Amino acid sequence: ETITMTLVQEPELFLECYSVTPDLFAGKSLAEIADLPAHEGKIQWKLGDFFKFEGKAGETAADTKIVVNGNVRRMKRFGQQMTAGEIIINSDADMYIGGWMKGGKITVKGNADSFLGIAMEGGEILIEGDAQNHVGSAYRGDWRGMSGGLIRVKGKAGNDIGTAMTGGTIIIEGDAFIHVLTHAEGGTVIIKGDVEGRVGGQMVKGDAYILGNLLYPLPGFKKVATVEKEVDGATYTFDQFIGDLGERKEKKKGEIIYGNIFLK
Amino acid sequence: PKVIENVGCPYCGCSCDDVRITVSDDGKDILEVENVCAIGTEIFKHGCSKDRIRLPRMRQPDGSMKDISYEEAIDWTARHLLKAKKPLMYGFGSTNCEGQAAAARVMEIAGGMLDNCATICHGPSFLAIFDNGYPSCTLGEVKNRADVIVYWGSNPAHAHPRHMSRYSIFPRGFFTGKGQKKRTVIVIDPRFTDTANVADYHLQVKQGHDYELFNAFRMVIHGHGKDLPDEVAGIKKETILEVAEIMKNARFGTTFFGMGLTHTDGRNHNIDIAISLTRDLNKISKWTIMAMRGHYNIAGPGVVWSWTFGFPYCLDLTKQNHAHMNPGETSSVDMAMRDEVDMFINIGTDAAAHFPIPAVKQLKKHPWVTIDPSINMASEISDLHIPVCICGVDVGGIVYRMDNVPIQFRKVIEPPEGVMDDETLLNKIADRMEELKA
Amino acid sequence: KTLNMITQRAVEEGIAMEIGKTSRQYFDACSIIEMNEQDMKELGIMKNTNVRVKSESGEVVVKAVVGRQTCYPGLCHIRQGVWANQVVPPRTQSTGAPQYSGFPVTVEPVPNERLKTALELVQGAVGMWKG
Amino acid sequence: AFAVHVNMERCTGCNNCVVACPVNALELNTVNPSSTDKIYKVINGDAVILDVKHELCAGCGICVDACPYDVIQLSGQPP
Amino acid sequence: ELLIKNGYIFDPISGIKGDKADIAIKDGKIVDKVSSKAQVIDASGKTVMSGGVDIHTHVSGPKVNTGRMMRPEDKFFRGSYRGGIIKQGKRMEMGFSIPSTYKTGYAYARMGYTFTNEAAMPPLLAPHVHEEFRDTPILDQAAMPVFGNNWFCFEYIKNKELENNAAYVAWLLNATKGIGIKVVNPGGTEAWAWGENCTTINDPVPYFDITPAEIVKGLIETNEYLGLPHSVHIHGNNLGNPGNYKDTLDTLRLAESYKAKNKFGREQVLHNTHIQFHSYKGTSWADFESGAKEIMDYVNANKNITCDIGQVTLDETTTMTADGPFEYHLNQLNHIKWANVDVELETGSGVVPYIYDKNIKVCGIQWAIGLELALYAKDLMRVHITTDHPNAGPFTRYPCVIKWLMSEKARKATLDTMKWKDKVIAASNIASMDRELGLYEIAMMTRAGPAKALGLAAIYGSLVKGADGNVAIYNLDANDLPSDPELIEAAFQNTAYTIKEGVVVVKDGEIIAEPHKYTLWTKVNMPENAQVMHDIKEKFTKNYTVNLENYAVFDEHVHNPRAIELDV
Ligand SMILES: Nc1nc2c(c(=O)[nH]1)N[C@H]1C(S)=C(S)[C@@H](COP(=O)(O)OP(=O)(O)OC[C@H]3O[C@@H](n4cnc5c(=O)[nH]c(N)nc54)[C@H](O)[C@@H]3O)O[C@H]1N2
Ligand SMILES: Nc1nc2c(c(=O)[nH]1)N[C@H]1C(S)=C(S)[C@@H](COP(=O)(O)OP(=O)(O)OC[C@H]3O[C@@H](n4cnc5c(=O)[nH]c(N)nc54)[C@H](O)[C@@H]3O)O[C@H]1N2
Ligand code: SF4
Numbered sequence A: 001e002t003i004t005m006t007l008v009q010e011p012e013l014f015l016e017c018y019s020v021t022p023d024l025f026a027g028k029s030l031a032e033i034a035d036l037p038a039h040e041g042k043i044q045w046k047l048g049d050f051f052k053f054e055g056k057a058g059e060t061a062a063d064t065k066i067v068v069n070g071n072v073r074r075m076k077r078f079g080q081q082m083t084a085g086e087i088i089i090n091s092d093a094d095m096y097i098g099g100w101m102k103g104g105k106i107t108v109k110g111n112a113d114s115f116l117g118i119a120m121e122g123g124e125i126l127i128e129g130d131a132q133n134h135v136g137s138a139y140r141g142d143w144r145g146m147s148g149g150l151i152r153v154k155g156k157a158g159n160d161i162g163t164a165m166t167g168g169t170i171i172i173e174g175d176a177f178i179h180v181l182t183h184a185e186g187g188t189v190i191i192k193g194d195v196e197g198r199v200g201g202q203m204v205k206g207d208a209y210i211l212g213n214l215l216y217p218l219p220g221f222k223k224v225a226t227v228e229k230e231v232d233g234a235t236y237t238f239d240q241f242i243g244d245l246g247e248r249k250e251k252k253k254g255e256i257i258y259g260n261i262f263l264k
Numbered sequence B: 001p002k003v004i005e006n007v008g009c010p011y012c013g014c015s016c017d018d019v020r021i022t023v024s025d026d027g028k029d030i031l032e033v034e035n036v037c038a039i040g041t042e043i044f045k046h047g048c049s050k051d052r053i054r055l056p057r058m059r060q061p062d063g064s065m066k067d068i069s070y071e072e073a074i075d076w077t078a079r080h081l082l083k084a085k086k087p088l089m090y091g092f093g094s095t096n097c098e099g100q101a102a103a104a105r106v107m108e109i110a111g112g113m114l115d116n117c118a119t120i121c122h123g124p125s126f127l128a129i130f131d132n133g134y135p136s137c138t139l140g141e142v143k144n145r146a147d148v149i150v151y152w153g154s155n156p157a158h159a160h161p162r163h164m165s166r167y168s169i170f171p172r173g174f175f176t177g178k179g180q181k182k183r184t185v186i187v188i189d190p191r192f193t194d195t196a197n198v199a200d201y202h203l204q205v206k207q208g209h210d211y212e213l214f215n216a217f218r219m220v221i222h223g224h225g226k227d228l229p230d231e232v233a234g235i236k237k238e239t240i241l242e243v244a245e246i247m248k249n250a251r252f253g254t255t256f257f258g259m260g261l262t263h264t265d266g267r268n269h270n271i272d273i274a275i276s277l278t279r280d281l282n283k284i285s286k287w288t289i290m291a292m293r294g295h296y297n298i299a300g301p302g303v304v305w306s307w308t309f310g311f312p313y314c315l316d317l318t319k320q321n322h323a324h325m326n327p328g329e330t331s332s333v334d335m336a337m338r339d340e341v342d343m344f345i346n347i348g349t350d351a352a353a354h355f356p357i358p359a360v361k362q363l364k365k366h367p368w369v370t371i372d373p374s375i376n377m378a379s380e381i382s383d384l385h386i387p388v389c390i391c392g393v394d395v396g397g398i399v400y401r402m403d404n405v406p407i408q409f410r411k412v413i414e415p416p417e418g419v420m421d422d423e424t425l426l427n428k429i430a431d432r433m434e435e436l437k438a
Numbered sequence C: 001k002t003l004n005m006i007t008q009r010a011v012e013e014g015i016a017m018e019i020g021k022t023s024r025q026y027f028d029a030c031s032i033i034e035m036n037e038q039d040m041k042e043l044g045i046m047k048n049t050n051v052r053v054k055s056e057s058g059e060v061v062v063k064a065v066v067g068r069q070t071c072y073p074g075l076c077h078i079r080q081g082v083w084a085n086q087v088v089p090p091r092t093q094s095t096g097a098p099q100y101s102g103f104p105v106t107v108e109p110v111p112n113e114r115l116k117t118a119l120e121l122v123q124g125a126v127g128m129w130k131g
Numbered sequence D: 001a002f003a004v005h006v007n008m009e010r011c012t013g014c015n016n017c018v019v020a021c022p023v024n025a026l027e028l029n030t031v032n033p034s035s036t037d038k039i040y041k042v043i044n045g046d047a048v049i050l051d052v053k054h055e056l057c058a059g060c061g062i063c064v065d066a067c068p069y070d071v072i073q074l075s076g077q078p079p
Numbered sequence E: 001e002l003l004i005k006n007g008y009i010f011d012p013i014s015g016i017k018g019d020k021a022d023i024a025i026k027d028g029k030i031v032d033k034v035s036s037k038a039q040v041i042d043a044s045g046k047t048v049m050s051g052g053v054d055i056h057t058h059v060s061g062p063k064v065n066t067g068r069m070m071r072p073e074d075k076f077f078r079g080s081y082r083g084g085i086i087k088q089g090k091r092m093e094m095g096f097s098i099p100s101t102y103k104t105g106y107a108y109a110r111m112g113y114t115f116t117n118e119a120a121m122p123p124l125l126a127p128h129v130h131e132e133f134r135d136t137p138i139l140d141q142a143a144m145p146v147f148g149n150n151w152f153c154f155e156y157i158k159n160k161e162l163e164n165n166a167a168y169v170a171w172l173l174n175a176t177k178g179i180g181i182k183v184v185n186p187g188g189t190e191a192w193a194w195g196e197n198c199t200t201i202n203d204p205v206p207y208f209d210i211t212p213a214e215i216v217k218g219l220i221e222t223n224e225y226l227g228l229p230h231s232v233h234i235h236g237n238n239l240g241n242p243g244n245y246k247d248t249l250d251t252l253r254l255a256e257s258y259k260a261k262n263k264f265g266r267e268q269v270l271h272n273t274h275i276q277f278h279s280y281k282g283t284s285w286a287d288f289e290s291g292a293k294e295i296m297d298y299v300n301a302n303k304n305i306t307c308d309i310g311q312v313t314l315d316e317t318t319t320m321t322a323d324g325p326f327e328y329h330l331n332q333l334n335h336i337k338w339a340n341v342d343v344e345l346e347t348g349s350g351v352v353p354y355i356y357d358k359n360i361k362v363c364g365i366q367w368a369i370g371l372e373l374a375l376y377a378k379d380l381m382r383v384h385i386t387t388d389h390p391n392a393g394p395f396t397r398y399p400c401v402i403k404w405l406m407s408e409k410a411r412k413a414t415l416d417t418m419k420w421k422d423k424v425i426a427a428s429n430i431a432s433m434d435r436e437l438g439l440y441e442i443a444m445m446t447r448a449g450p451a452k453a454l455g456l457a458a459i460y461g462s463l464v465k466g467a468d469g470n471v472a473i474y475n476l477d478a479n480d481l482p483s484d485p486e487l488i489e490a491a492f493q494n495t496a497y498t499i500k501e502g503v504v505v506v507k508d509g510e511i512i513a514e515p516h517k518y519t520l521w522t523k524v525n526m527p528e529n530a531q532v533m534h535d536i537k538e539k540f541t542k543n544y545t546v547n548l549e550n551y552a553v554f555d556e557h558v559h560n561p562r563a564i565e566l567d568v
């Protein structure tokens, strides 16, 4: 039902432990799990060379559940392409956590480096630390990126929030920095703090709820209405702005749809 | 007194090839150099020097630096490249395209990280190209057709000196027989640069607000420009409308950009909003963005590694059979910050001088090798300094201009007796590594 | 006081590096602040006098001059090189391009202090300053 | 027939004084070129005026207006 | 030095259908008899052909490098690499579409192909093409300079100087080391430099007042006068729009008064390429059907016109054509990336990703059109197989094309898995079509068609005596074709063996070695024209940024040339 991983040998460089997912851990013997591949530099380690396992995984990823209890703050690629199950990181983390995920949930109890939730397609993330930039951002050179799921960064976010976002939701309980929802097409972003600006640039469609204070509003948004909206909370009486008039707009049946950014 | 035509100046993105050298009787002293700018004149004057490095040089325990043979330096580098766990090879701004192919092969054998000056220079631009595209043109196109010229965040007068007199403004083309007098030049940057002196307009913008400026322009172009605020980025709405009207009426425009866009807030988003503006202008006119690449063959690593691995820069060659690229994770500066390297190889650049000093401090914890023709900061804080020929002066080859047009550079001086060139050197390193059987 | 700052090029600077990174020409060309005349008066900086440029990621003593390329009130400028990169912050914003232009900095008029050469700066940052 | 003086100390070799001079532009850019002599040519990185005896200049100011960092002084008074 | 004993032979140039013949390669060139010191190959029950020849493929050049830069999603997608993971050879293979040079070479070697004709190259950008060719691994390769928007060839076909234009084509070919002539969107690509396009065959170029018809005719006269190996490879006008089958017939009627004169064997006078792109019909994309019937009726009539199909392989791809207006129009349709590279005094360019997915009536009909073209051909020697890689799909989907041709079950399967099957079958004809091209026909239109059309069937494309020893052995037996079309897919995807001028380079589908390659060019020997010399010098002084002495590819930047020489 559960697996316990505990770091025993500290790796001098960063370990690309992509193999640590419920998908690879499901229905495997303890020795097999301990010998799943893991890279480091240009060398490939066996994943029993840096961890000590104690548990019994399930027949299915949707059954199993991994718990990492060490200083895994120099480990990258945890949760990659995780289809179902559960992961817990009782520390902080590094790059690509939950990348290209399609279900399940990652509960990082600490921070996180860049590229958290890159191109995610479902499931949950429950960070309580200060996630860096490119949270939910699509991979370089792509146009259809994040298309579902939930990201909950309970700390200070950074750049490139929800770049080229298509669906789903990115909630940042702290505040943010430049370039939120650029190139986007759909979904929501709920920032609950001060934003430097540049929010909604290049947007074709989508929503960006903000409860802090935009310090540099882009010229491409104009106020059109003051609406009450229950977003993650209750009636906050937002004054919506309409569309990025700088960028072309997709048209629906008999009406042009704008990418409306809200505000407090 | 043996005048040599059609030489290449190996410094700026212009890759000027209209250079005339009057080499001495013995073919090893350069007497007078015509048609080149000063920065170039000095490159040739340095290449033709009499007292120049000829052998490698190693750091002894005492801290001094003594010479060793080429085979010993190749052995040192090969053994270290194999023993390391994630070496990083950086540079390639100033090398022939065979120098950037041999390096790709060497690091394919090794398994480290291969990278160029694109990361710290116009790599934010490539990241935008990946997002939006690169509507561009060759430089003869703007020479022969351009009616409006925009220098957004660039300074040709001091970056690329003979850019204006060769490609953009002053030449009298085919459809621009009237020369400058029918070209409208707009220069945007917070300073009043020498390019702005020569220009006819100037949009003195607050440093860092170029995104708001581009968004204003694009709302004007998309048509309901009345919704602009009174002023944008320090620029006044009537001036915005003036420049936008000129841009709309341009028969064939061209936009150049540089550090004003690739080194400020929103590194790549500035460039991609610029590219979006260009794609929008091509609705009613013809407009072509174009990046002010710096070193001669800095577009050479891009194309060579494009054909070899498919990725222009930030190459993750550690899996040994599939490469990866993510600039935020695989770039030289970020890896130096997160001490994710094991060895730094200085090839065709000056990392010590031109990196942030925290990154240099983080990097020097490991061994450090420099392959340069002459003394510089990297060759002063390295562990061994392997000499190499200079492109365009001691050795010829292909280089790639600002616009990815291959110029063929010629050789004017034979290199000092003993000194080899980087393609021979990198090939010997790869041969020795295969001898060491890894 | 917050005094936003940029780092850029100049022909004399390019000329200097191709003379040599360790040359008096390079020293003269790069160890330079090119700020506004109004800002120089308001801060209290004598023209052509050393000054302490101290950002959050370092510090450097650099000559303070006025530049033809008119910086608007509230802007600074160092020709790129050893001295500028002693004070450039390394933040990349997950793009690999450090904040080479547009970082805040405070400026303190500190004459009677020498300028640090290029070798001294780099080899002392690393810990190799034999001389 | 005026006299132009180029401050060699701040000349960068930009060559925009050579390209922009309308007497230089006579050879290659005219139908049936009349005179093929040239005022400036950038030798060793600085603009050299071959028009030593001040016979071809016409005080146009295209070259003074062209140099990006003013370095060409035009004398309108007899040398 | 080698002999391939007891394998079925299919050599259309010698009319050989399933004979148990033996090929005795001897030092790169096929010879009748070799002694018992030659290492043998027991190819029993395996279909032997000759080393395939590809006539139209963009496997190099500035367009392709611009695509590789612009599109890094191409290599990496959804976490895993769509190019697959493999290091069979001494290097890497990156890229699903527009593969890196090391993947293109290895993938063709595994296909059996041995010659690839890189279609379009701007003449100014010749060192680029010759550099990528040095890095392609085993395939011999030639590139075709583009002469349909050159300003010098706009002047001469304006002023009616056949001799001067011929001297200029010979000079260009000798400089860029090309092998023929490609006209990409005659005239229109230059109007794109101002932002317009030549939407028909008759409208004049801006400021030049020459027309697509005049320029095509002038280049045909030049080509057949010089007797170049390959004909005038032609793109066409009004590409990618409904109703342009009329214009395609109008442009094909431009050859009705010429005869192919040369010392090489070719019956074409012009080669109309990706015709499934030129064979549309109707007004817009809602009243859009197939004109392949009319196009192939005209081609089945005329014997001096040879074609190739641009069959779409129904996947994700980047489309690179040397003409701007088509790519710009496509960008305005689908709102995805777009790259444009205008050359100076020469051509244009355009790179735009595109999704040929199965869930669109338009893409379904586009897929059906190429099959209708190929299955309406009475003579297959004149209709070849390409995909305009990557414009209609990557070349690693050639076996899918061959499966679709050779098995109607495959076509029924694709049409059934297609979304708007009712609309596609209503607006096409491929649903009810029995023809399954035979193995002889597929060998014909894959190996002999392209070689004979290129007019180099002497060395490539056949197993007759004296030819170049390039042989490709396949798994499938010629006596009974496989029941499951996936078997055909695999059989043509992976070759049992492959020999390059006598040296085995692929075994079981696994790369083995890479000896070397040739880069063919044309070596017209003729006295120079003072008039064209003067015009070229004047034009480089006034208009080109590069110099005349640095335009010609240096003698040391070409990789084992082996020219094809000519006279006068
Ligand atoms: N403060 C500040 N710093 C910056 C920037 C900024 O904007 N502000 N910009 C950053 C950017 S844009 C970059 S490009 C860097 C640029 O800085 P660099 O890329 O480091 O450029 P150079 O210092 O001129 O490097 C030239 C060295 O390569 C040698 N060389 C010449 N030819 C060859 C050859 O053929 N082979 C080999 N092996 N060596 C050769 C030369 O002798 C010389 O040693 O500056 C960066 N640093
Ligand atoms: N002599 C010499 N020549 C060189 C070099 C050198 O080091 N010395 N470096 C070479 C190389 S490596 C480079 S990459 C190229 C690049 O050189 P360029 O790309 O042309 O850029 P810079 O010369 O640094 O000047 C950039 C201009 O943008 C202005 N700027 C700063 N911030 C902003 C902003 O926020 N908005 C706007 N609109 N403008 C801003 C700056 O004031 C400056 O005027 O030059 C090359 N040429
Ligand atoms: S502009 Fe650049 S390439 Fe041209 S001469 Fe000057 S330094 Fe050389």
Ligand code: SF4
Pocket (backbone or CB within 6 Å): D004, D020, D021, D022, D023, D024, D039, D056, D057, D058, D059, D060, D061, D062, D063, D064, D074
């Ligand atoms: S004043 Fe006119 S004619 Fe005289 S040198 Fe200058 S540009 Fe030439």
Ligand code: SF4
Pocket (backbone or CB within 6 Å): D006, D010, D011, D012, D013, D014, D015, D016, D017, D018, D042, D046, D047, D066, D067, D068, D069, D071, D072
């Ligand atoms: S334009 Fe000015 S800087 Fe340029 S070469 Fe002439 S005098 Fe010198």
Ligand SMILES: [Mo]
Pocket (backbone or CB within 6 Å): B117, B120, B121, B122, B293, B294, B295
């Ligand atoms: Mo640069």
Ligand SMILES: [Zn+2]
Pocket (backbone or CB within 6 Å): E235, E273, E274, E321, E322
């Ligand atoms: Zn085509």
Ligand SMILES: [Zn+2]
Pocket (backbone or CB within 6 Å): E056, E057, E058, E119, E120, E321, E388, E391
């Ligand atoms: Zn094609």
